[PDB]
Amino acid sequence: LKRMIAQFAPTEIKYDHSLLDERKQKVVENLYRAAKIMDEIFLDQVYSKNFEIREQLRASSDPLDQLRLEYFTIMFGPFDRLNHDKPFIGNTPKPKGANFYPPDMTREEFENWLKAHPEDEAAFTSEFTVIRRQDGKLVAIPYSEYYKEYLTRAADYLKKAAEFADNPSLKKYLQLRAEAFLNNDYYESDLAWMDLNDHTIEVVIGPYEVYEDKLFNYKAAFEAFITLRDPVESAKLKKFVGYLDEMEKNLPIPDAYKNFNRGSESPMVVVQEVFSAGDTKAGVQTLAFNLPNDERVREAKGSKKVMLKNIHEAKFDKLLKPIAEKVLFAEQLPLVTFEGFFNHTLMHEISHGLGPGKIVLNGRQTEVKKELKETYSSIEECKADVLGMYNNLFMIEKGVYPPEFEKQIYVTFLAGIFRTIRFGINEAHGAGNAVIFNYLLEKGAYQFDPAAHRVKVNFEKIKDGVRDLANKVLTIQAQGDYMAAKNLLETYAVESEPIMIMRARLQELPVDIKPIFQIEKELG
Ligand SMILES: N[C@@H](CCCC[NH3+])C(=O)O
Numbered sequence: 001l002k003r004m005i006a007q008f009a010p011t012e013i014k015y016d017h018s019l020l021d022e023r024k025q026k027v028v029e030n031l032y033r034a035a036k037i038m039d040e041i042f043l044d045q046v047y048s049k050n051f052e053i054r055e056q057l058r059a060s061s062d063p064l065d066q067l068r069l070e071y072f073t074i075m076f077g078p079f080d081r082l083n084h085d086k087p088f089i090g091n092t093p094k095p096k097g098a099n100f101y102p103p104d105m106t107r108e109e110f111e112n113w114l115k116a117h118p119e120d121e122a123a124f125t126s127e128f129t130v131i132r133r134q135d136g137k138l139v140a141i142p143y144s145e146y147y148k149e150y151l152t153r154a155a156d157y158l159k160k161a162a163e164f165a166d167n168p169s170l171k172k173y174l175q176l177r178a179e180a181f182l183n184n185d186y187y188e189s190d191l192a193w194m195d196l197n198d199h200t201i202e203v204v205i206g207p208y209e210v211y212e213d214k215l216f217n218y219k220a221a222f223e224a225f226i227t228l229r230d231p232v233e234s235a236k237l238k239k240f241v242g243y244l245d246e247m248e249k250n251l252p253i254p255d256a257y258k259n260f261n262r263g264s265e266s267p268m269v270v271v272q273e274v275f276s277a278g279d280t281k282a283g284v285q286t287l288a289f290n291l292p293n294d295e296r297v298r299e300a301k302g303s304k305k306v307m308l309k310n311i312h313e314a315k316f317d318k319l320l321k322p323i324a325e326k327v328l329f330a331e332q333l334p335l336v337t338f339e340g341f342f343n344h345t346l347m348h349e350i351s352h353g354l355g356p357g358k359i360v361l362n363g364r365q366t367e368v369k370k371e372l373k374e375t376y377s378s379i380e381e382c383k384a385d386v387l388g389m390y391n392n393l394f395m396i397e398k399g400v401y402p403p404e405f406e407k408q409i410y411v412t413f414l415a416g417i418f419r420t421i422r423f424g425i426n427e428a429h430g431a432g433n434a435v436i437f438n439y440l441l442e443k444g445a446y447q448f449d450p451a452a453h454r455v456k457v458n459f460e461k462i463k464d465g466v467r468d469l470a471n472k473v474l475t476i477q478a479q480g481d482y483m484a485a486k487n488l489l490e491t492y493a494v495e496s497e498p499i500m501i502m503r504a505r506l507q508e509l510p511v512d513i514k515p516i517f518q519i520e521k522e523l524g
């Protein structure tokens, strides 16, 4: 268990205290108390025995149980999220429905209930209800009622925080989100969250991501981000959203493929994380999130893309830098910079909003996601990473970035390929990185030394290689070419021998990070 815990390097998550006066301190304190309740709620959402298992580990005298508790705390359950939820306590497999559904309820019984009781479909499929067996029936119990005890205390902490919040947009959001916990309707407070302006505390708290529900991907998990907004860095990102049409017109495709029906633009903010809780804190840590998922909000006001700068700093120092030291030639190692890591994530997120979407295939109105089917996510993340380099090169052309940043782009991404791929080559993001590495290696844009076991950028072919792969992925999307998407993945999204060799060199490094929050040492 000592080595499994070592996969997450302990790192201290600190924040700038000078950004908060006395009254903002009391906001963050009460926001922290509500976020710790999100830790308790989500722990119950993962598995019904989580609280009972935690209590057994707490009272146990076995020194081995205290090591199992440390990994339990990391994973919010007895299942190893780095290894397909393999239980490290006992051997009972994790329910596919976590704790949102009865463990003996299949998809068939669920779908058979909605056929016999059509009136329950809106409540049963809702992101904010749990399914339970009662009196020979299946009932949908809203989150506001199933977790009323926790959410009432969490709402009171939000109400107390709102009294100390002098920023009107912040005060309004905290008040409405407090009510949202109890009336189970998060739409009005989601809109207030998108309207946060001229504020320091960038905070989001509530149920959002549905990826814990591995039965239907229906139910959302409670989580929290408490971050501090950075005006100097968020200002530098205000011009990137002004280049959105320019980046699209500049894409390496015929004009008929270029998409100016992309929908509402997303606001983007660079923040310093103070505390995270719930779904996001389990296992691997988030570098940036994109909320809300409500299409009703994303149509009206878009979604907010929040970049966690200090989490990037932790991952760069603990992971990307040690990986680059082992995978790159010494002459290219200095080109690995924090700017190359953080600014790619910025442009990776921007690039998701570019490229084909609503398309016409054989005269029918359709979508890239509908046509690519299971290949869409791998192709989409491949597009975002390739365009992230392409558009950052475009930002150099326009004087936004200095010329010496060009080589940092290529090299830092190459080093980052082998941080992402260690998470798993079958995931969409890892699959997309496998394509980029194997394709650019084939083109000669990357080079693998079979004796030194190191990779490098070929600066004479890397620019065209990125353009070539961008053209190919964008064209596959614009034509809805599911067959070419499959063949691209079958050919290049593979664990090639160079990848196997480089991966073997990194077995002793941490996989991710364990957050040790300064605020937890302050408020305890
Ligand atoms: N996006 C993370 C890995 C996945 C985290 C999912 N919550 C990273 O690049 O470090």
Ligand SMILES: [Cl-]
Pocket: 024, 167, 170, 198, 199, 200, 201
């Ligand atoms: Cl504020």
Ligand code: NA
Pocket: 279, 280, 281, 282, 283, 284, 285, 286
């Ligand atoms: Na996580």
Ligand SMILES: [Zn+2]
Pocket: 348, 352, 380, 381, 384
């Ligand atoms: Zn992505």
